[PDB]
Subunit: 216 residues, 6 copies
C-alpha cells in the first residue's frame, strides 16, 4: 500500500483509484491540512504499512500513536526539542538505509552530529528540497545552493520531514547507538561502513569504489 520511505505526494496520487474519489485531494496542502483536522506541511504524518476518502485519517492516527509511544519511552539527552524534530530525524534516517540492523547506527551518526554542532550533510534532504528539479544525479552546484532543507549549508534539522517514516525508523531516531561514528558510506556489498574520523571514511569510500568496479 504505502511503503516506508515513500513521499507524501506518492501516496496522494495513488487519487488514481476507483475506491477513493478526489474530494480534498487537489486542494492546496496548507488548506488541506486545515481541512483534514494541525501541522502546516503534510510530509511524514502518515504511517507506512501494509494495510472512503477519510479512511488518510486512520493512517495519521496510526502514525501519531506510533510517534507518541516512541516519544514516551525515548532515550535521555536527545537533541530533540519536541516529537516533531524526532519525526524529522526519523524520516532522515529512513531513506538513508534499507537495512533495519543499521537503523540505530545511522541514527547515532546524525544524533551525535547534532550534539557536536556538525551539519548532517545527508543527500536526501537536498534531493527533497529540489524536488521536481532532481535529475537522478547530484552536482556540487546543487549542494552549494542554500535550500531550506539543504543540510550541507544549514545547521541542525530541516523544517519538516522528507518522507514517510516507519515505526522502526521513529524508534531508532529515539534510540541512537553507543558509538563515536559520525560518518558512513555504502559498502557496495550491501550495507554501510560507519567511521569516526574523515580519513577512515575516505578509505571506506575508496573501498566502495573498488568493490563497485569489481561488481561491474
Amino acid at each position: 500500500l504505502v511503503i516506508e520511505g515513500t513521499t507524501f505526494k506518492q501516496l496522494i496520487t495513488a487519487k488514481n483509484d476507483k475506491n477513493v474519489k478526489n474530494t480534498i485531494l487537489d486542494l492546496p496542502d496548507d488548506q488541506l491540512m486545515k481541512a483534514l483536522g494541525p501541522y502546516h506541511h503534510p510530509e511524514g504524518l502518515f504511517a507506512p504499512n501494509t494495510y472512503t476518502d477519510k479512511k488518510l485519517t486512520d493512517l495519521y492516527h496510526r502514525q501519531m500513536k506510533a510517534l507518541d509511544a516512541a516519544w514516551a519511552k525515548r532515550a535521555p539527552n536527545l537533541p530533540y526539542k519536541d516529537k516533531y524534530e524526532a519525526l524529522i530525524m526519523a524520516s532522515i534516517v529512513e531513506k538513508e538505509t534499507s537495512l533495519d540492523s543499521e537503523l540505530t547506527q545511522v541514527s547515532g551518526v546524525f544524533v551525535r552530529r547534532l550534539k557536536l554542532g556538525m551539519r548532517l550533510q545527508t543527500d536526501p534532504t537536498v534531493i527533497y528540497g529540489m524536488g521536481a528539479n532532481y535529475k537522478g544525479n547530484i552536482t556540487r552546484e546543487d549542494l552549494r545552493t542554500p535550500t531550506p532543507y539543504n543540510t550541507y549549508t544549514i545547521n541542525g534539522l530541516p523544517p519538516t520531514p522528507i518522507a514517510l517514516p516507519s515505526q522502526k525508523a521513529i524508534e531508532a531516531a529515539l534510540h541512537p547507538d553507543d558509538s563515536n561514528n559520525i560518518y558512513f558510506v555504502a559498502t557496495g556489498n550491501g550495507g554501510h561502513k560507519f567511521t569516526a574520523d574523515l580519513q577512515a571514511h575516505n578509505q571506506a569510500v575508496q573501498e566502495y569504489l573498488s568493490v563497485l568496479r569489481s561488481k561491474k
Copy 2:
C-alpha cells in the same frame, strides 16, 4: 534469487529463534528425512564429530527456515547451520561497535542468546543489550531469569521458585559474576547485531510492561517503582 533469501522438492528444516540446541536435536531425531548418524552423541564427542572447536554446542546453529535434501545426513545439516551461524557472527564482529566488554566473539554469542531470550520486540533489542552490556562494564551481575532456567536444566518443570533463583548453578546470573559459560539458546542474526551494537543510554534496569515491551531505567529507585507497578498489574489478570 529471492528464495535463496529464505534459505526441486526437499525436506524443510526449521530452527526457531530463541530455541535451544537440544530442541533442534530432538526435532531432527523426530524427522524421517534426516538420517540418524550422530544425533545421540555426547556433546564432546559430537563437537569432535562435526569439527567444531568449541567444547559445548549451544548457540552455534543459526535459526532460519532451510531446505535440505530428503535423506540428508544429520552431520551435513548441523555443519551447514554451524557455518551459517559463524558467518553471521564473524560478519557482526567485524563491524562491531568500539569499547565492547567481550573478550572474543564467543562472549558476544553468549550475550546474543541472553538478549534473544529476554526480549520480544525488535525495537528493544539494542536497549536490552545495552542494559546487559553496561552491567558487564559496571560489574553488575546480569540477573536474568532465562539463564537460571538453563542452569536448572533437567530440574525445570516449566516454573521457577525463589529457591531456584537462590540456587547456585554455573549459569545462574543471580549468583555468578559476568556472563554464563555458554550460550543458553540459539540467537538470531538480529540478536547478534544487537549484542554488538548497544544503545546510547544510562539504563541498567528494565522490567516488562506486560504487552511485550519493557520499562528501562538507570536508577534502582525508579526500577523498583516500575517493578512494583508491573507486579500489581500482572497479579490481577
Copy 3:
C-alpha cells in the same frame, strides 16, 4: 569436421588460457604444466614470463593438436600484431621497447570497456609516465594479489609493495597483466592529445577524464550521486 574451438577473449590471463587448454580433450598436454621459464624456453619465446604474449581471438584447431603448436601460433599472431603496431607507432612515446607497449596495452585493456575511450585511457597513463607519476591503476594491484583477490581491495592491499602494485612501484609493472586486444595495443601506441591524468566512471557507461585532482574529486562525487539514485 566440427574441429575443436579454442576461444581466447580479451582481458583474460595466460593462466586462464593454460587451464582452458588443460581442460580440453582435443588438446594434447605436452608442456602445459611446466614452470613459466622452462615453458617459454620450450616454445622458443625469448621472454621469461608468458603474460600478454598470446593474441585473444577465436581459433579452430584439429582435434589432438599439440599444446606447443597452439601456443606457438598464438604467440606468432600476437607478435605479428605488436610488431605491426610498433612499426607505425607515434613519436615520443615513453616505451623502451615493444614489450613495454604490450604491458601498457594490457593495463589499458583491463581499465576500459568502451573502444571510444581507449586512446584517452592510454593518454592518461602515457602522460603519467612522462610526468613521473605512478599509474595507480587497480587491475595491476589485483594481478599482484592474485589468488588472494576476492572481488574487493582494502587499504592494506593498496599499501602492500607487491611487484605489480602501481600505487607503490614507479612506472610499468614487470610484465603485462592480461592478454590485450589489437585495438588496445594500437591505443597504447597512439595516446590522445590532452592534459587529462585522471578518470572515473560516470555511471552512464563511460568515464569522466580530468587533468587536476579537484576536478577529479568533483567527478567522483557526481558518480557517487548517480549510483545512489539507481
Copy 4:
C-alpha cells in the same frame, strides 16, 4: 541497429543528397517534401541550419513500412545531434573549433579521408594540428564537394587550382559546411585528436596511410603509392 519493416541503411561518408535520392526511390517511404528546395526543407523539418549536410546520422535503420519521410529524417537528425552534443560535452581541451558545427565539419572531412577506424584519431590529428599552424588542409573530398554538379568522377589539376568555397587548397581553414554525413566514431575522433607531430599523410593502397612530420619522407611515400596505383591498373 536502430529500429522503430523497411530497412533504410545510411552508410557513413554519403552525402545528404544521396540519402534524399535513395528515399525518393523507395516505394515503402511516403514522399511528401523530398523535392522541395533545401532551405524550405530545413524550415519544414524544423532544423535551424541553413545547409543540411552532415546533420543526419549514418546507421542501419528499420522503420515501419509506409513511414513518412519527415519522421525518418527528423529521427536521423535528432540522432546525429544526440551524438554531437554528447561528444562535444566530453571533448578534449585546446581544440581549434569555435563551436560544435566546426567539429562536425571536421568529422565529415576525417570520415571522407579514411576507411580504417584505427587511423581516425591520427587523421584528425593531422588536420587539427594544421588548423593550429595555419596550414591549409589540402584534402581532395572538399574540392570535389566544392565543384559539386561539375564533378563527373574525375579531378584535374585545374580543378584543384580553381577557388571554390569548399576548396581547402585555396581556402585557409575549414570549409563553410560539412561535405558528408559523419559517423559517431568520426565525430569522436574529430573531438579527440592524437598526440603526434605528424602533419602529412598519404594512402598505402591497402586501405591505410603513412603519417609523417616532414615533407621528404612524405614524398618518398607519395611516389611509392603512385607507383603501386599505376602498376596495379
Copy 5:
C-alpha cells in the same frame, strides 16, 4: 676452488636457516638481526607472500634451509625472495626428475610431504624410508598419523605434550583425523627431504617408530609395529631414570 665456495650465497652477514624450522622462526630471527633491514617483516603473512611475489597463500615450507651469506645491511625482501627462489628451484628440479606413480597432485603436495618427512627423521639414511611409509600409506588410504602435524595444527595450544585428547581433536593439520596431506607444509624442508618425498624406498613397510638409540625401526604389519613400540617404550623408560 670455488666449488666449495658455495656453502650458500646471495665482512658479510651469515644468515643460517636450519632444517625443520618453521617460517615464523625465520621471520623472528630476521627481525632480531642487526644487519638485516626491516622493511616488510611485520606484514600479515598473506600480504607478505604477495609483497615478495609469491603466488602461494601460506608461507610455510617455501624457504630453503641452508647457511647463507648476505651483504651486511641487506634488505629482508632480497633475502626472502632469494630463499624462495632457491626453494622453488630445488622443488622444480626434484619434481621434474620425480619417481613414477607417486600420489601427488602437484609439487606443492610434494613440498608438504617433504616437510612432514623432515620433521619425522634426523638421519638422512632413513629419509627415503620415512617418505616411503607415508607415500605407501596414501595409496592405501591410511592416515599418516604423524605427531608434528598435530602439533602444527594446535599452534599456540601446545605445551610439550600430545595426549589422546589432543590427538582426537579435529585440526586442519591433524593427520589422525584427516585423510591425506595437511593443507600446507608444517616446516621448511631441506633439499634432501624434497628429493626423498619424490623418491620413496622400495619396500612394503607402512609403519615405523623410534628405536630409542637413535633412528627408527620400520615394519610392514601392525604386530611387528607393536612389538617395536614395546621395545621403544622399554628403552626410553629405562632412560627416564
Copy 6:
C-alpha cells in the same frame, strides 16, 4: 518455476545439447565424449538411441555441477512428461507405445513454430499413419542425412532411402529426430478433429491444411510464389 542458465531449446538435437554442455565452463565433463551407446549406458537410460529423451526448458543450474546429474534430471523430467501425457492420451491413436508418441512429437516439433497449429500438424500425421500414407517430412530427411547436410536439400536427397527418410519408408522413423517440448508431446497425443492430410507453409507465418491433393497443390503454388517474392536481395 523455471526448472548459470542451462537452456535447451525445443527442436534442438541431442548432439547440439552435448556440444553445448561440452562448450560450458560451468559444467564439468565426465562422459560427454563417450559414444552414445556407452553414454546411455553410463546414465542408466534403457533406450539404445539418445535422441528425443531430454526436455527443453530454462534451468538455471548450479555452476560446476556434474553433467550426469543435469542429463539424468532432464531425462527424468521428459519421461515424466511423456508418461503423464500417455496416461491421458486420446483414443484410437496409431501409436504402439509411448516411444512412437515421442518420435511423432519430435517430428511435430520440427514441423511447426506456432503453438496454435501443433494439434493440426499432429492430426495430419496421425491420419496419414492410419491411411498408410508416408509422412513426407523434410526434418526426417535432414536427420537421416546427418553429417552430410550442407543446409540444402536436393531431389536425389529426398529420393535416397535412409532409415529415417519419410518419403521412402512407411510409418514412423526408428527414433526421434529432435528433443520435443511437452506441448508437442501432448499435441502428438491429442490430434485435431479434421479430415486434413496435407499441409504446407504459407511463408507469412503458419501453414495451410487441406484434405485433398488438388487443394494442397494450389496451396503449394501460392507458397512458392510468395516465398520467391520475399527473397530478392
